[PDB]
Amino acid sequence: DVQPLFTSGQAYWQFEIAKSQANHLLRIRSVLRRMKAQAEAAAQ
Amino acid sequence: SPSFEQQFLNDKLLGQNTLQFTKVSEKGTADALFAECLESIRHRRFKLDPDVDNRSSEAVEKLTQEERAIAEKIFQRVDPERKIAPRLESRGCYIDPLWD
Amino acid sequence: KSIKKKITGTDNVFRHIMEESFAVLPEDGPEFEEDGGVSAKQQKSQILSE
Amino acid sequence: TLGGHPRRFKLMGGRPEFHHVDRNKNGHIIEPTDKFQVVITTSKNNVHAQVVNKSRAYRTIFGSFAGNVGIRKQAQQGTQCAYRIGQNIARKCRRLGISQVEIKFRRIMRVNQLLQAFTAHGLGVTAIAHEPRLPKCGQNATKPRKRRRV
Amino acid sequence: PLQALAALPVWQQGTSPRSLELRSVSVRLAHAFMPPFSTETEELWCAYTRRLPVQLSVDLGLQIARLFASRNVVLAEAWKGLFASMDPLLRELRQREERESAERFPDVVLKLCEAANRVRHEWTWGTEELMLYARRQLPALEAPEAARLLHALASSPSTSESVVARLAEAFVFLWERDLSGAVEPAAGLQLLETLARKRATERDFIRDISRRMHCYLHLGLLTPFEKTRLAVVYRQLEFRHFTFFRHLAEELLQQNAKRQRLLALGRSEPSADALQAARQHQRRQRLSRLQTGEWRWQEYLRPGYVMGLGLEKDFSPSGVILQEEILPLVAELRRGLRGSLPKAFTLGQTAVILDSMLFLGFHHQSRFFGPVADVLLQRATERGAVETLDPQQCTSLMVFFAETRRQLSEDPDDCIRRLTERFVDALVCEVASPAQCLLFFKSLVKWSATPLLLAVCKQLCKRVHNFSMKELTGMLRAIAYVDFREPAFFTVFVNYLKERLGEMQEEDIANVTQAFNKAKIEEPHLFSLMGKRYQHLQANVMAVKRRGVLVRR
RNA sequence: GGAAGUGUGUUUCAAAGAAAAAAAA
C-alpha cells in the first residue's frame, strides 16, 4: 500500500514498468491456477 | 522443469530484452548452494501457496497524453544529448538494488 | 552497379580480415557475449546475488 | 478548322501513322521494355510537350504544341490550349501503346491542365519532377531583359 | 510386350477378399515387370491404368500410389480415377476416426500427397486437407510427426509461404531446444530443407542446426550424399558459409591428389563412378532375376533416389578423419567462448557442389575455387562419365561450364554435346523437370553467346501446363538464341501468352521480347499487351538519370 | 553510355531525335 520515494523520474518510470509487468504475470498465474482447479474438479 | 526463459523468451519480442535479476555463480560455490536451496523452498511454497497472493487489478492509463508529453520534455532536458529510454540494465544507478 | 560507374581492382581487405578472424572466433560460434557491452556489464556489477 | 497542323496534314505521305519516325534495328518504334517521359515546356504563349523513350537514350518519339493541335494566336494563352495539348499527348500515347509516363517540366504554370487531361484520358503518371534549373551564380551575371513599361 | 498385361489376373469384379488378394498380386507383378513410364512405354501404362467407380482397399490404394510414384505415371486420367475411387475410403476412415474420438487418415493422406509431389502432380483437395489438419492439430503432433507434416506441406507447390512460415515458427518455438540439442543428420537436413523450400526466417535455429551438422562433418560421420544435400540446401537458403565450402573444395582437391598419387603407381583404387555403375548393374541384375535407357531410368526412379545425389543407400560416412591437414571446418565450446570472450564424391555430386558455390559467388571472392574447377573440367571432359548422369547433375555441369567460360583451359565441346544429348534423352523421357530444364538451356545459351533441338521443341509444345511463365518465356528465348527460326513453333505460343497475360513479370516480358526479336516474328497485339503490362509493373518504381533508383514500390 | 532484370561479373538499345488530328485492328 505504501510505495517508496526516489530522487529521479527515471526510478518512477522503471517502477511503473515493473508494476505493470508484475500485474500481467499475476493475471496469467491466476488464470493458470483457475484452470488447474477446474481440471482437478473435472477429473474428480 | 523448463524455466520462464526456456519456455517463452525464445520468441523474437520476448527474447529481445531479458534483464538479469541475480548474479550468476558457478556450480560449487556457497552462492550457488544458497540459490539452489532458495529455489527449492520457493517452489515448495508455490505448491503450498494461497489464492489471495495471485490477485491482479485491471490495467488503466498510467498517464494522460499531456502528462506524458510533459514527462518526455523533462526527461529530455535531464539528458539533452541522449534519447530517453527505460535503461533497465542501468537500473541499479537510479534504484538501489535492495529496493528493486 | 555499372561497370563504368563502379570501383574495380580494389582489395577486399575487409573480407580478408573476416576470413582471418574466423580463425580466432569460429564462424559457427556465438555472436555476442553473456553481457552485451557497457550497459550489460553495469547491470552485472549492479545486480546483487541471493 | 481541321484540328491539326495544316502543313503536316497537307504533306502527309499517304497517312501511315508514325511513318517518319526512325525505328530500331528490330523494326519497332517502341520496344516492349521501354519507359517513357513527357517533358513539358510552358510559357505565356505556348506549351511544347515532348514524349521521349528513356531506353533509347532519351530519344524524342513525337511532340505536340498549340499549332499541332490547331490553336493560333491569342487562343494559345488560355487553359483550353494546354488541356488540348495534354489530350493530344495522351491520345497519341494510347495509340502507340504507352500507358504509364513520367512527367518533367521547368515552369509549373500551365501544367495542371496537361496533368488533368492525362488523368482523364487514361495516361497514367508514375512520377513528377520539377526541374527549374535556377541560377546558382547570381542575379545579374548576364544582364537580363529590360523591365516592361519602364 | 503386352503378354504380361494380358496374362496378369486382372479380370475379376467383386468385393471378395479373394478379389482383393488377386488385385494385390497383380499390382505386385506389375511393379516387378512393367517398365518406367516414358515416351517408349505410353500405351501400356494408359491401358493398364484405365482397366484398373471401382472398389479398392487402403493397402491396395497405397500400393497403387507407390507404383505410380516409382514408375512416373503422370497421366491425368489415372490420378483422376484413383482419387475418385479413393474418396469413399478416405471419407469412411475420416468418419470412423471422428466418431471414435467423439491405418490412420492423416498418414494415408500424407502418403498420397507425397506420391503426388513425387510425380509432380498437384492434389489440391489433399493439400488443403493437410493444411487444415496442420493448422488444427500442430501442437498435438510430436516433434518427428510435426517435422514430417511440415516437410510435406513445404514440398507441396500451392501451400502459402506465409502460412507455412508461421507454422514453422510455431514448431521452432515449441521444439527448438530438444532438436538443437540432439537431432540426427537426417532430421536436421529435412528441417533445413523444409525451411528453405518456403523461405522461413529462422536465423538462429538454422545457425544452430548448421553448427551441429558441421560438428558431424568435422567428426567425419557424414556421407557424400549428406554433404551434397547440405551444399544444396545452403544454396537454396543463400547461406554463404565460407569455411564449409572451403572444406568441401579441399576435400575434393585431396581426393583428386590421392587418386593421381595411386594412379601414377602400379596399385590404384577403383573410381567412385565405377563403383556406382557397378552397383547400378547389380541392381539391374537383381531386378532381372526377380522378374533405350530403361535400366538407368528405373535406377534413377527407385524410391531411395534423389536427383542430384544418386541413391542414398550407396553412400556411407566419409571417414573419421579424411583431411590430413587441419580441417577448415559444439554447445559446450559455444558456452566457453561466450563466457571467455577471447566415401567419395561422384562427378555429378561435384558438379552440383560447384554449382552451389557458383550461385553463392565463391568463384569471385575466393581462392579455393579455381583448382577445383580445373579438377571438375578434367574429370568431366573424360568419355563415359557424362553418359551416366542425372538431369540435375547435367544441369549443374552445364551451369559450371557456362559460368567458367573463360577459366576453362580446354574447349570441351564434345563433352558439352554429349551432356546435351543425355539431358535431351532425359527430357523427352520425362525425368527432367522444367526447373532443371530451363536452367540447362539458359546455361547453354550463355556458354555459346561468347534432331535434338526439334525433340526439345516438341517436348515443350506437348508439355505446356507443367511450368510457369518464368520457364516458358525463358525457354522460348533460349531456343531462339540457340537458333530455331520456326515461325510455327513461335506463333503457337502467342495465344497462350495472351491468355496468361497476367502472370508475366518484367523478366517474363523480357524473355518473350528477346525470343520474338531474335526469331524475326511480328505480333503487334502481343507486343502492345506486353508493353502495357510492363508499364503497369514499372509504375511503382521511380529513378533519375545519373542518380540510380531512389524509391522502389 | 541510356533503360531494366536477378542462376550472377545479366540482358537489351545505342555516338543527336522529332514531319496532322482523330480512330479501327
mmCIF file with all atom_site columns, C-alpha atoms in Angstrom, chain E residues 6 19 24 60 107 178 183 188 190 231 238 266 280 318 339 344 351 380 389 394 398 421 485:
data_model
loop_
_atom_site.group_PDB
_atom_site.id
_atom_site.type_symbol
_atom_site.label_atom_id
_atom_site.label_alt_id
_atom_site.label_comp_id
_atom_site.label_asym_id
_atom_site.label_entity_id
_atom_site.label_seq_id
_atom_site.pdbx_PDB_ins_code
_atom_site.Cartn_x
_atom_site.Cartn_y
_atom_site.Cartn_z
_atom_site.occupancy
_atom_site.B_iso_or_equiv
_atom_site.pdbx_formal_charge
_atom_site.auth_seq_id
_atom_site.auth_comp_id
_atom_site.auth_asym_id
_atom_site.auth_atom_id
_atom_site.pdbx_PDB_model_num
ATOM 1  C CA . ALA E 1 6   ? -2.772  -59.811 -70.963 1.00 0.00 ? 6   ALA E CA 1
ATOM 2  C CA . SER E 1 19  ? -10.540 -60.496 -55.480 1.00 0.00 ? 19  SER E CA 1
ATOM 3  C CA . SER E 1 24  ? -2.680  -57.079 -54.826 1.00 0.00 ? 24  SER E CA 1
ATOM 4  C CA . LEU E 1 60  ? -4.288  -51.569 -52.455 1.00 0.00 ? 60  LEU E CA 1
ATOM 5  C CA . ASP E 1 107 ? -0.957  -40.856 -42.525 1.00 0.00 ? 107 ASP E CA 1
ATOM 6  C CA . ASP E 1 178 ? 15.394  -30.752 -27.983 1.00 0.00 ? 178 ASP E CA 1
ATOM 7  C CA . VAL E 1 183 ? 18.996  -34.109 -33.758 1.00 0.00 ? 183 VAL E CA 1
ATOM 8  C CA . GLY E 1 188 ? 18.360  -31.774 -39.328 1.00 0.00 ? 188 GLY E CA 1
ATOM 9  C CA . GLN E 1 190 ? 14.947  -32.378 -43.516 1.00 0.00 ? 190 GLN E CA 1
ATOM 10 C CA . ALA E 1 231 ? 25.505  -27.802 -50.041 1.00 0.00 ? 231 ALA E CA 1
ATOM 11 C CA . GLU E 1 238 ? 21.601  -18.299 -49.650 1.00 0.00 ? 238 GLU E CA 1
ATOM 12 C CA . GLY E 1 266 ? 51.158  -49.667 -60.144 1.00 0.00 ? 266 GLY E CA 1
ATOM 13 C CA . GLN E 1 280 ? 23.594  -49.965 -60.683 1.00 0.00 ? 280 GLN E CA 1
ATOM 14 C CA . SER E 1 318 ? 33.282  -40.434 -45.462 1.00 0.00 ? 318 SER E CA 1
ATOM 15 C CA . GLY E 1 339 ? 31.885  -16.679 -21.297 1.00 0.00 ? 339 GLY E CA 1
ATOM 16 C CA . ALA E 1 344 ? 33.906  -40.208 -52.056 1.00 0.00 ? 344 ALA E CA 1
ATOM 17 C CA . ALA E 1 351 ? 29.086  -30.659 -60.382 1.00 0.00 ? 351 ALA E CA 1
ATOM 18 C CA . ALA E 1 380 ? 34.110  -34.171 -66.901 1.00 0.00 ? 380 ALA E CA 1
ATOM 19 C CA . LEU E 1 389 ? 24.414  -38.625 -65.036 1.00 0.00 ? 389 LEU E CA 1
ATOM 20 C CA . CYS E 1 394 ? 23.831  -32.456 -66.177 1.00 0.00 ? 394 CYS E CA 1
ATOM 21 C CA . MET E 1 398 ? 26.235  -27.054 -67.881 1.00 0.00 ? 398 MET E CA 1
ATOM 22 C CA . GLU E 1 421 ? 22.238  -35.392 -75.736 1.00 0.00 ? 421 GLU E CA 1
ATOM 23 C CA . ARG E 1 485 ? 13.748  -19.868 -86.571 1.00 0.00 ? 485 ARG E CA 1
#
